[PDB]
């Protein structure tokens, strides 16, 4: 897609496995310690989620 950094195979293979190989998996989690760590990330997220 973009790959300025060519080490994207980890994420691409992840998708290939989950999405293509396993096909269905709309119920997955694995946030050890919780999932509210975004914090500052949520700021840019608000910026991204605001407009379509």
């Amino acid at each position: 897609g973009s790959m300025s950094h060519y080490g994207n195979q980890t994420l691409q293979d992840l998708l290939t496995s989950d999405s293509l190989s396993h096909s269905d998996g709309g119920g997955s989690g694995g946030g050890s310690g919780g999932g509210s760590l975004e914090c500052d990330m949520e700021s840019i997220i608000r910026s991204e989620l605001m407009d379509a």
């Binding site: 989690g29 999932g35 990330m41």
Partner: protein
């Protein structure tokens, strides 16, 4: 949306699955049930706007998958390194 022949090569399952990952990346969900939380409507809204944007942006589902896998990739490591080691 214009009529792109490739969109018949991608069912709701695949795209909604990628939407799910968009959420899993932006939100390190502790449990699959946090994916039905009040924050979910918002995350999935973001994910649907994002997915739909790139869906319309690409000329193949694999491309749309690729470029979306790119943005999700950077988002993941962004949140991980920011919260972990740059601060």
């Amino acid at each position: 949306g214009v009529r792109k022949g490739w969109h018949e090569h991608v069912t709701q399952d695949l795209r909604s699955h990628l939407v799910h990952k968009l959420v899993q990346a932006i939100f390190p969900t502790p449990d699959p049930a946090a994916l039905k939380d009040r924050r979910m409507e918002n995350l999935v809204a973001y994910a649907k706007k994002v997915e739909g944007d790139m869906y319309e942006s690409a000329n193949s589902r694999d491309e749309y998958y690729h470029l979306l896998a790119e943005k999700i990739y950077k988002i993941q490591k962004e949140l991980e390194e920011k919260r972990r080691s740059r601060l």
